Amino acid sequence: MNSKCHCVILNDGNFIPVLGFGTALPLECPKSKAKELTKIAIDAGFHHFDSASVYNTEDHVGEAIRSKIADGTVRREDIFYTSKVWCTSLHPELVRASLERSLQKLQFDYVDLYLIHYPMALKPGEENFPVDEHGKLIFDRVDLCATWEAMEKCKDAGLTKSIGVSNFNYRQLEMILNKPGLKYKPVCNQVECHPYLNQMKLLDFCKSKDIVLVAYGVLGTQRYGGWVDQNSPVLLDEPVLGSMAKKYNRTPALIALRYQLQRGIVVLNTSLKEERIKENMQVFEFQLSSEDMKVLDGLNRNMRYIPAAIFKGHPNWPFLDEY
Numbered sequence: 001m002n003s004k005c006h007c008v009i010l011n012d013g014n015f016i017p018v019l020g021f022g023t024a025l026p027l028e029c030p031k032s033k034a035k036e037l038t039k040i041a042i043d044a045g046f047h048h049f050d051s052a053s054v055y056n057t058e059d060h061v062g063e064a065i066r067s068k069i070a071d072g073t074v075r076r077e078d079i080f081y082t083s084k085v086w087c088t089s090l091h092p093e094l095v096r097a098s099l100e101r102s103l104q105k106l107q108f109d110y111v112d113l114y115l116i117h118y119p120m121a122l123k124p125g126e127e128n129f130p131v132d133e134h135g136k137l138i139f140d141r142v143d144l145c146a147t148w149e150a151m152e153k154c155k156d157a158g159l160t161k162s163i164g165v166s167n168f169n170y171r172q173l174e175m176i177l178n179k180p181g182l183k184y185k186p187v188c189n190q191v192e193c194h195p196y197l198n199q200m201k202l203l204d205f206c207k208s209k210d211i212v213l214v215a216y217g218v219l220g221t222q223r224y225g226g227w228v229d230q231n232s233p234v235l236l237d238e239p240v241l242g243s244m245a246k247k248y249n250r251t252p253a254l255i256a257l258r259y260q261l262q263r264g265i266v267v268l269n270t271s272l273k274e275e276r277i278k279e280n281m282q283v284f285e286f287q288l289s290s291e292d293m294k295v296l297d298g299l300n301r302n303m304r305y306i307p308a309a310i311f312k313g314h315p316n317w318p319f320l321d322e323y
């Protein structure tokens with residue numbers, strides 16, 4: 001993956017496309033749906049795909065990418081693929097084995113990016129959400145800094161080109177960077193980010209430490225049951241996004257997307273519909289003026305669509321802190 005892309009440069013020297021297609025799905029969808037959407041995204045010009053072991057779509061996402069490679073549409077070297085290790089496998093001795101598993105599902109030799117999915121470990125086992133009889137997740141205690149060293153080991157094994165974190169707070173990022181004998185800084189922190197939760201402080205913090213912020217929930221999230229309060233407001237129905245979309249001759253979505261791009265953020269997106277997937281690629285075509293950027297900074301309202309509420313009582317729930 002070389003410099004001839006709309007890409008930013010990670011602190012390990014590697015390139016990441018700034019617009020990524022997300023491969024998580026609503027509960028209501030078969031997992032094969034991800035094969036279909038990946039083929040569509042590739043044809044629309046997407047090169048960056050984001051996934052996770054817990055998504056359980058990596059095997060279908062791999063079929064889709066591999067058939068596009070086979071038929072000559074793309075090369076592996078022009079695809080940027082991310083996975084994430086899930087809470088059940090954060091123990092140092094389980095991190096690599098989880099990555100080897102995903103590579104086997106994918107039939108890939110490496111992933112371009114591998115993240116800690118959440119800074120919170122759960123009871124190890126095949127079950128992704130181990131619970132007790134009250135329906136409550138079983139937390140486990142892990143040294144996150146030991147998890148980090150196992151990540152670094154995955155990078156020096158060639159299993160992943162870069163390593164980063166997802167859903168870390170300021171204090172949790174510090175932990176890692178201040179860890180003695182640190183070999184690689186996280187290249188990114190993938191966190192929810194939209195006009196209702198604009199992450200100004202964590203963005204500024206990540207920038208100061210050469211950490212790329214990669215945003216999900218750019219469009220208000222797919223609202224997954226039950227991660228998202230079904231009575232939170234729908235981001236893209238927000239009047240000022242409608243107003244600005246008319247002004248610029250776009251839609252609410254494109255305005256949301258462009259807002260993040262102009263902030264130096266790497267942006268994820270998912271749609272189940274082909275024509276949206278094609279539409280999201282128009283983000284590259286137009287500029288929002290700086291007074292309009294300030295307008296959108298004003299929507300900030302601490303509306304967190306995915307607080308990972310099922311984790312609330314975890315020693316490490318990242319979302320208590322201001323940022």
Ligand SMILES: NC(=O)C1=CN([C@@H]2O[C@H](COP(=O)(O)OP(=O)(O)OC[C@H]3O[C@@H](n4cnc5c(N)ncnc54)[C@H](OP(=O)(O)O)[C@@H]3O)[C@@H](O)[C@H]2O)C=CC1
Nearest residue numbers: 022023024216217218219220221222253269270271272276
């Ligand atoms: N790191 C983490 O912990 C997490 C990471 N993720 C990642 O983020 C990716 C993106 O998902 P998420 O953040 O939930 O969803 P987004 O915020 O990217 O999109 C939200 C909604 O926007 C709609 N939409 C997309 N394009 C348009 C458009 N052009 N016009 C109108 N509506 C549009 C989609 O609906 P529709 O399908 O109806 O078109 C979708 O439900 C995931 O696939 C996964 O990679 C997700 C959650 C957590």
